[PDB]
Design a protein around this nucleic acid. Structure first.
Ligand SMILES: C[As](C)(=O)[O-]
Ligand SMILES: [Zn+2]
Ligand SMILES: [Zn+2]
Ligand SMILES: [Zn+2]
Ligand SMILES: [Zn+2]
Lengths: 74, 73
DNA sequence: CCAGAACGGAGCGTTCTG
DNA sequence: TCAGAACGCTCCGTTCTG
């Protein structure tokens, strides 16, 4: 019964930064929190984040990582 | 103070038949020749501006066409 | 099993040329 | 004039490494 990334719903590879996620979201989040995450949504801050569309809006993908509970120290 | 009709950045000239910037010029060339189809994460209504145009190639491309951008022109 | 690094690919935007 | 090539850059995601 495949476990699913809580950010993007791709198949999860494990528990990363405290949350069931895929590898791309693990490493997106690491990039976002270390960089200057000055991301802008071109829509209404409710973009659909899935495997096909997660590249599209880092702002909304980052928000979802935060709402899911991701954090570096866990 | 002429502005790109796709993204409202500073326009560099007339490209493919529309007053556009350089990034929109080359983006549209790439979009057309490359047959890759895009999908909006929002509502096919994204705000395309200097910073946000990176975010939705689907909406940016739709705007290039509605502006009348055209190869052979 | 997980974090962090590395690596190759894609896309974007400038610059230069004629 | 503007079309096009090309390059350096950022970001992405899979794979390694510790
Ligand atoms: C294009 As790939 C499989 O190296 O992310
Ligand atoms: Zn994911
Ligand atoms: Zn968004
Ligand atoms: Zn433009
Ligand atoms: Zn869009």
């Amino acid at each position: 019964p495949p476990k699913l990334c809580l950010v993007c719903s791709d198949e999860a590879s494990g528990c990363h930064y405290g949350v069931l996620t895929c590898g791309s979201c693990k490493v997106f989040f690491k990039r976002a929190v270390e960089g200057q995450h000055n991301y802008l949504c071109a829509g209404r801050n409710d973009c659909i984040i899935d495997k096909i569309r997660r590249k599209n809006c880092p702002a909304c993908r980052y928000r979802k990582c935060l709402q899911a509970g991701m954090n570096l120290e866990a």
